[PDB]
Amino acid sequence: AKLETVTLGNIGKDGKQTLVLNPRGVNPTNGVASLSQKGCVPALEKRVTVSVSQPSRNRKNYKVQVKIQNPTACTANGSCDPSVTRQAYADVTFSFTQYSTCEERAFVRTELAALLASPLLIDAIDQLNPAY
Amino acid sequence: AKLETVTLGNIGKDGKQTLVLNPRGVNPTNGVASLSQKGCVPALEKRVTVSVSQPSRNRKNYKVQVKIQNPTACTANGSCDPSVTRQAYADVTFSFTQYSTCEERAFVRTELAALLASPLLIDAIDQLNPAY
């Protein structure tokens, strides 16, 4: 769809933070759609990735792979220019047979989107308690 | 977390569907929290798996990996019982540094959620139209 300024809202632990993204160049070599929170320095803005890929000789089914990468900056700590101390990744790769329906896919798209709102996934991420 | 029956509503391209998930067993051996729908016949229940893997004795970062596996039965296959003509995977794998805050994780949590409802991911999943 239209490579557009994405405006993600009602997010964060409280559901009250927002994020504006800017379509930073389709392709870069490998058909990976990139975005970022526009900023001066690059290695400080958070990024995303969308990468649709059709079935190959070796690979037979469709694969939609979305990546998220958020860093963590550290300012005037002796130097003058900020620096990074950790990049909190996030990665999801879907998979769909050639014979899937639009209702069959949007199911997974929304089943996960609502799953991240479960009282299990939150405690299994926000606190990293496993499953019991 | 509280591994009770997990409900998931307002899902699908319709947005007016709902899914039940019953706590069908934890650790097979991999720490895999395994879930399923109300199912008498196994190979037809839609499943999810949630995994918290502590830093090993060789790798440092955490890994929260959730997987989703939904089938598609063929009931009127002529023969007794139905059969599955296609699965439809989904694999999200997180990464966090030992110095991540819950607010740094829960951010990454909510970002992906609202992202799955974004107009681009819809066309990139429900329709498989890539970086247009």
Added chain:
Amino acid sequence: AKLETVTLGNIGKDGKQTLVLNPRGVNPTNGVASLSQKGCVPALEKRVTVSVSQPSRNRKNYKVQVKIQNPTACTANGSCDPSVTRQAYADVTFSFTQYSTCEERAFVRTELAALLASPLLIDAIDQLNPAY
């Protein structure tokens, strides 16, 4: 130019059918413009692909390659969801020296166009009789 919903009119043996295609991204790994009949389930819709290529190491002349495939469905069987029983590849690869004129190429373009309607090609494409 603009990769838009290219309507395709007056086609078929009766010339009274009509195909409609839609933009479906590009560059999976080789810069292929991809068009498709808009159907919900993939491997059931008639695709069209087109590619341009500036000449390179071995390739010393510009090449344009259009590929056409139309699947054939089959309602049922001893199963439910429709199945594909036979494809129908159509492959045309142009070639021009680094010196051709837009009057030189458009000749070959309109020529092969107007050629797919001669009694020879009609009787060798629809009925498949060699030329005697």
Added chain:
Amino acid sequence: AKLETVTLGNIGKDGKQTLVLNPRGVNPTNGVASLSQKGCVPALEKRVTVSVSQPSRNRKNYKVQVKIQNPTACTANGSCDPSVTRQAYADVTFSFTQYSTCEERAFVRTELAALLASPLLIDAIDQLNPAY
């Protein structure tokens, strides 16, 4: 499939030029048809070869192939007779199975017909602008 004086009309970008072709025999060991512009000198005349191929045992499918060859020349270069300076290949090959209907084939023929007159194809052939 009578190999007579095949005549092509409304050709060229202006859609008003006209081309003749003449039965330059059949089967030069390769079982290919041959047509050539009204030329008493060979290499300076435009060719067209139409070939059908029954399904052997190295390939299960039929393959009708057409090979348009339009050479460009210039007389007042350095002699008293013209010399071919650049050609213009255009290879097209179809593929059908033993279970294709006549319309099933003619569809592909007529689909490619108006395709070569699309606004998309012309910009990528006459001016070589790829997918935009």
Added chain:
Amino acid sequence: AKLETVTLGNIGKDGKQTLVLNPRGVNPTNGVASLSQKGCVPALEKRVTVSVSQPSRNRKNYKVQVKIQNPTACTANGSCDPSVTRQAYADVTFSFTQYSTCEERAFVRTELAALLASPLLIDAIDQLNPAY
């Protein structure tokens, strides 16, 4: 961004010269754009492409590469049509750290541009002269 026509003005040795540029897609199977003065003769077009290279962990550096490829024709030469007799290239590579600022870069952009107008580079590019 918006790959579009560039109206490059007040150029040449004097300054009354002016150039028109047009897009030629944006992929050419390696992330480079493709720009050319609208000449229907393909090799006679003055080329200009731009590329942006995400810092592949191969090497941790952003990289933007502009190349200019201008040919010279030979009207009569030998045959009717002209021929290229010498293409004068021009290649520009920039490198910026993952912590560069859009004022740090824009400086280098403007510095180089304003530098080509120096009497040194004029007497060093045009009449080809080192320094003393």
Added chain:
Amino acid sequence: AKLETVTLGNIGKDGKQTLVLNPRGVNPTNGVASLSQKGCVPALEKRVTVSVSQPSRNRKNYKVQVKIQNPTACTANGSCDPSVTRQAYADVTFSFTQYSTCEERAFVRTELAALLASPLLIDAIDQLNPAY
């Protein structure tokens, strides 16, 4: 020619910035000049060199190479004295045939200079953006 002070003016993102350059001999054991803003601290000087390479029968092409090397300081950093934290390069190579004309070259000189002021290269160098 006369390796001397260059008063590079009206540069930077805005245009109020202005740079002073001074010679540093002309040999540095490889034909390149050496220019540096008169900073007594040696590594903190912004570098610029120019070279002219006679077409060694190794390869029959004249070649003029300009390189720009600008560093960024870190005042406090750790110790009393500052330290370089990232040098942003810039490298330009031209090539001309033994039959190029000083209007053919001066064109490429001015064309490149006037090109860096394009909105494309601005949005492609500064905010780092490919094209679409």
